[PDB]
Amino acid sequence: KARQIGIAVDPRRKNKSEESVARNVARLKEYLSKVTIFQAIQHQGVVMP
Amino acid sequence: MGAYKYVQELWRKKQSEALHYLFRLRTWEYRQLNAIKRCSHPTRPEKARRLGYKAKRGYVVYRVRVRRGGRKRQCVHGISYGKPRNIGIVGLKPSRSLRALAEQKVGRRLPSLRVLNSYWVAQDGSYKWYEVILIDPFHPWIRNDPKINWICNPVMKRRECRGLTSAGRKARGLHNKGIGAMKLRPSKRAAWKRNHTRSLRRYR
Amino acid sequence: AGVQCTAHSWGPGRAVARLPRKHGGIGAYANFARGGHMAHPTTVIRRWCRKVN
Amino acid sequence: PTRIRKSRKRRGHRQMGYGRVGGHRKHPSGRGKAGGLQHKRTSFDKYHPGYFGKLGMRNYHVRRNIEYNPTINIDKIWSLIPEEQRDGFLQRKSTTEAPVVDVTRFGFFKVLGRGSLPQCPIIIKARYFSSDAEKKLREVGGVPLLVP
Amino acid sequence: PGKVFNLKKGGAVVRIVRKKETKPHQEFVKSIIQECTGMAPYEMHIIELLRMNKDRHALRYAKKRLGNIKRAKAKRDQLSVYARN
RNA sequence: CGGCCCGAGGCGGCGGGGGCGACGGGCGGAACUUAAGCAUAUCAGUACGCCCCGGAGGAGAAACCAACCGGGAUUCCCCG
RNA sequence: CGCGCCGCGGCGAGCCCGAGGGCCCCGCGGCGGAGCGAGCGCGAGACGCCCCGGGCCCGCCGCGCCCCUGCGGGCGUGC
RNA sequence: AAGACCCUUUUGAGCUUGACUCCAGCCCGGGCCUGUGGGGCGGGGCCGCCCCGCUCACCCGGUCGCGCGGGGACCCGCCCGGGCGGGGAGUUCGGCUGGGGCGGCGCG
Numbered sequence A: 001k002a003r004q005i006g007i008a009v010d011p012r013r014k015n016k017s018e019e020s021v022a023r024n025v026a027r028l029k030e031y032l033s034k035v036t037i038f039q040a041i042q043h044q045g046v047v048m049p
Numbered sequence B: 001m002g003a004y005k006y007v008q009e010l011w012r013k014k015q016s017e018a019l020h021y022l023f024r025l026r027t028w029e030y031r032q033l034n035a036i037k038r039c040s041h042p043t044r045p046e047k048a049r050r051l052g053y054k055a056k057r058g059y060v061v062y063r064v065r066v067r068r069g070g071r072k073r074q075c076v077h078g079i080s081y082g083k084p085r086n087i088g089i090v091g092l093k094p095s096r097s098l099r100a101l102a103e104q105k106v107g108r109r110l111p112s113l114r115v116l117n118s119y120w121v122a123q124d125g126s127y128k129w130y131e132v133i134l135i136d137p138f139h140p141w142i143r144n145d146p147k148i149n150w151i152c153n154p155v156m157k158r159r160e161c162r163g164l165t166s167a168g169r170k171a172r173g174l175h176n177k178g179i180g181a182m183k184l185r186p187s188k189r190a191a192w193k194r195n196h197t198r199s200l201r202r203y204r
Numbered sequence C: 001a002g003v004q005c006t007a008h009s010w011g012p013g014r015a016v017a018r019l020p021r022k023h024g025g026i027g028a029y030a031n032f033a034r035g036g037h038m039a040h041p042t043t044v045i046r047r048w049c050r051k052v053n
Numbered sequence D: 001p002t003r004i005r006k007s008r009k010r011r012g013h014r015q016m017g018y019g020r021v022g023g024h025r026k027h028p029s030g031r032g033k034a035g036g037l038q039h040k041r042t043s044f045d046k047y048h049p050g051y052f053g054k055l056g057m058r059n060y061h062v063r064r065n066i067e068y069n070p071t072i073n074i075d076k077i078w079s080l081i082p083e084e085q086r087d088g089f090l091q092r093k094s095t096t097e098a099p100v101v102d103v104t105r106f107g108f109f110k111v112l113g114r115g116s117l118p119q120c121p122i123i124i125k126a127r128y129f130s131s132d133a134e135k136k137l138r139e140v141g142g143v144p145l146l147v148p
Numbered sequence E: 001p002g003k004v005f006n007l008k009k010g011g012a013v014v015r016i017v018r019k020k021e022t023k024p025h026q027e028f029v030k031s032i033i034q035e036c037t038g039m040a041p042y043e044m045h046i047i048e049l050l051r052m053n054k055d056r057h058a059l060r061y062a063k064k065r066l067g068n069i070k071r072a073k074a075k076r077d078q079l080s081v082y083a084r085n
Numbered sequence F: 001c002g003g004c005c006c007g008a009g010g011c012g013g014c015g016g017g018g019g020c021g022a023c024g025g026g027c028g029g030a031a032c033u034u035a036a037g038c039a040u041a042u043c044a045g046u047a048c049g050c051c052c053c054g055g056a057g058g059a060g061a062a063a064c065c066a067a068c069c070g071g072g073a074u075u076c077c078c079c080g
Numbered sequence G: 001c002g003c004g005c006c007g008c009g010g011c012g013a014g015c016c017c018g019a020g021g022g023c024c025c026c027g028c029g030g031c032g033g034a035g036c037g038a039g040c041g042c043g044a045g046a047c048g049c050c051c052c053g054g055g056c057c058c059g060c061c062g063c064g065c066c067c068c069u070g071c072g073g074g075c076g077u078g079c
Numbered sequence H: 001a002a003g004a005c006c007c008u009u010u011u012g013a014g015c016u017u018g019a020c021u022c023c024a025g026c027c028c029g030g031g032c033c034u035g036u037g038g039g040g041c042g043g044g045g046c047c048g049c050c051c052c053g054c055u056c057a058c059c060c061g062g063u064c065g066c067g068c069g070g071g072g073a074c075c076c077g078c079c080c081g082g083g084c085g086g087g088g089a090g091u092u093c094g095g096c097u098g099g100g101g102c103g104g105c106g107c108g
């Protein structure tokens, strides 16, 4: 489901701590806000540097 | 469960009375035949499926006999000239294993087929016998089948001549990764050429 | 350029200078011979650009 | 530029500074570094002591980022505080609002003791201290601290 | 040294401790196969030595055949059960 | 007398073989040269010989690296 | 192409057209900033237009003395 | 005709051998190839050797397979080990010096 809307998924990686999860969940939560699904704007460069 | 779990367990007892008798009858027979011979069906059906065989039109099996022991150089009168580090004649070892040499011999005999894989069947003091799987790539059952028709594309011609089979991969060192393997991954020649290149940039 | 032909010295004892010669005796392979290579041929690895802060 | 070189001033001189008696030949000493213990021994002992031999333990693979260890002296500590704030901190030598400086954020591990500090309490957090860095810091009213 | 020295190491974050990670069917297949094969000739030699209480000889012989001390100890333990009588 | 097994001769449709001064893959493999001599070493896992593809090829989704408040298939570039 | 020294330009406890991305714009290492010790490791202020010498401080090797958290700390002496 | 005699160069090559370092080849031993039986000697408290039947592996002959043999678990081959080895390979064969060599050693 996440691959479909532009998120890269790496099942080989494992988290090493609890902070690693909170920092990236907040990153996932934010991106889902600024995404629209169908005069539209194409985003340049790396997304959320 | 199924039957092939028992057959695999059995083949891990090659020293037993039963398999010692059956291994004896096979080497006597293979000693009475030619070096390269077509087989009706695989001698080991369970190992054949482990390596990719399928009982369909377009898969074939041949038995190949190769000779045991080391390597002797082709030098007239047994004379190497040159430096003394390069003088040896007998007692050398081939770079490829005997399994890889079996596949290359049968690829040369049958150049209109595609070599897939191979496995061991017998040995004695003078010979080892391997069986080689080959696919005919212009048969319609082969071409229209998504499981195998990767081999119908032309970058798959004479694979064993280019070191791309499993036994050919081992001699190039490619069953390893990590420390001890950093100078071989594209090719031994490719890593040497990359590591010895003079790159003269414009704004040097 | 200058090194596609076959030429070797005749040596002393034949009353001629010691440069390499083509079969027949024609001078070759020296910067002072007609048709020979340059003494130090030009190469594209010359540093063409320069740096400025 | 070829037109300002010393070698073009020798056109017409038969031998381009290499002499008549000696001359310019191919390799009159050998190639490279050869001869260092025999016929260049007078050169190698005058300028290169300790070129020959062995010395010390060997490690078959060094970990470059384990052995890495940056350091900072105490005389450089107050320059990590931005200039807009230093005056005020000196103004009020507070024990109850002293400045905290965490030097790992700036990329240092150990604190050494060359120099001196201003008369002002300050807190320094690091991974290791030298003995006189601690001594000069406690002389000022400061405290050392260890951080993760 | 293979670690970087610092007290309070690991003091900022909370680690994740992953779970560390039989099959009676396989034990059942071996029991049928064992019945119609027996043991290998080197395994029978070990059993005879173990019956005579030459334990160190049995370990030496298994290291020579197997080439790895942990497997040679695992095999001699495996064979004692059939070597007790 | 039929079946299965292991072989033989013929007939039909389809496929293979040879070619290239580069790049690419797999094998066999020097000596000149340097060491101010010369055997180990170096030149060079190069010249050259044999085989095999393609428009690229090879490699590739960890029996990996690490020792961190850790990364995460392959290839290529910068850096030591 | 690599090494040494000299001269000139820009900036200076800093410096820098990597590769790359948008003769212009943005752009990591790196080198310098601390040394010494085979290594465990420990770690520099006291003077001086400049130069030369003296004195003292840091490390490596040795050794009085006192002590707390102890084959660990402090204070000294010597090539 | 850039002395062919003579000398020097850390330039060669042909030949020789009691130079230095080695290689083919050959001889010798154990192992795997490799069956199925019968016996003797010795040791240590099961181990080492050796000997001799059979035929089925493996090997050789006769024959137009026209009415037949001989050997045999030994030989060959392969792996590792030891010996012989100018038949062959590569390389070396100091310096000073009233020219070099013989001799001598102001070569430490």
Ligand SMILES: [K+]
Binding pocket: B035, B065, B066, B067, B127
């Ligand atoms: K054969």
Ligand SMILES: [K+]
Binding pocket: B081, B082
């Ligand atoms: K030669």
Ligand SMILES: [K+]
Binding pocket: B081, B082, B083
């Ligand atoms: K030669």
Ligand SMILES: [K+]
Binding pocket: B083
């Ligand atoms: K050599």
Ligand SMILES: [K+]
Binding pocket: B169, B170, B171, B172, B173, B174, B175, B176
């Ligand atoms: K391999």
Ligand SMILES: [K+]
Binding pocket: B178, B179, B180, B181, B182, B183
């Ligand atoms: K490696």
Ligand SMILES: [K+]
Binding pocket: C003, C004, C005, C006, C007
């Ligand atoms: K030529």
Ligand SMILES: [K+]
Binding pocket: C016, C017, C018, C019
């Ligand atoms: K001449």
Ligand SMILES: [K+]
Binding pocket: C017, C018
């Ligand atoms: K001349």
Ligand SMILES: [K+]
Binding pocket: B204, C051
């Ligand atoms: K530059």
Ligand SMILES: [K+]
Binding pocket: D016, D017, D018
């Ligand atoms: K000069």
Ligand SMILES: [K+]
Binding pocket: D021, D022
């Ligand atoms: K001179």
Ligand SMILES: [K+]
Binding pocket: D026, D027, D028, D029, D030
């Ligand atoms: K020379």
Ligand SMILES: [K+]
Binding pocket: D027, D029, D030, D031, F036
């Ligand atoms: K030279």
Ligand SMILES: [K+]
Binding pocket: D033, D034, D035, D036, D037
């Ligand atoms: K030297």
Ligand SMILES: [K+]
Binding pocket: D054
């Ligand atoms: K040593």
